[PDB]
């Protein structure tokens, strides 16, 4: 369960 790993 990861955090917001979407690219910046």
């Amino acid at each position, epitope marked *: *369960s*990861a*955090p*917001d*790993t*979407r*690219p*910046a």
Partner: single-chain antibody
Amino acid sequence: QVQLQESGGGLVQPGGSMKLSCVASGFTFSNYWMNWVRQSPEKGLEWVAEIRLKSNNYATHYAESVKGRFTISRDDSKSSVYLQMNNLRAEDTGIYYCTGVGQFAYWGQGTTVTVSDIVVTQESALTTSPGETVTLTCRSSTGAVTTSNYANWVQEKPDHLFTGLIGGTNNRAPGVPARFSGSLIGDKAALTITGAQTEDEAIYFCALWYSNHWVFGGGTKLTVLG
């Protein structure tokens, strides 16, 4: 120049309520999770709540210090996030920031609210000089830091001006100067400034992720002398 602008704070009585707002521009707001984080002199920087995407049915998580009392919401059509704060207590006093993106690149200017168990450890202070290489570290009380903690590093400059430097252990946030890098070293997260500049004198905080919440470290005061 992405912008997050908070509003709503003030001077409030214990037992009361208020709602903070935050309006975003410059990035696709609706693709990112958003967070509220607060700063007080005592208790330092403290993650409060997060809200995820429409595709996650806007799922939320809260710090245990505010669960039952606070509600985070977003309005993607107005690119806004909100924090409804009920049953306020003295300990809720602080500066409140909306922040997000990979994972804490963008911070609002903050709104002041005056009301009247993992420890993450950082060096209290380090001193360096222009042109030197300095490394700050971030230890977890649970054991080793791994990439599963998605270590973030954030810089605080005067006056309570926060900017994210590093997310996901070693990903530099957009527009962050190349002298900053993230690593894992000796089972700690670390931030390195390779060639410190006078303007890097600042307070640096790390954040580590544990499954569904962030714990901030207490911050490191970096002095750049000479």
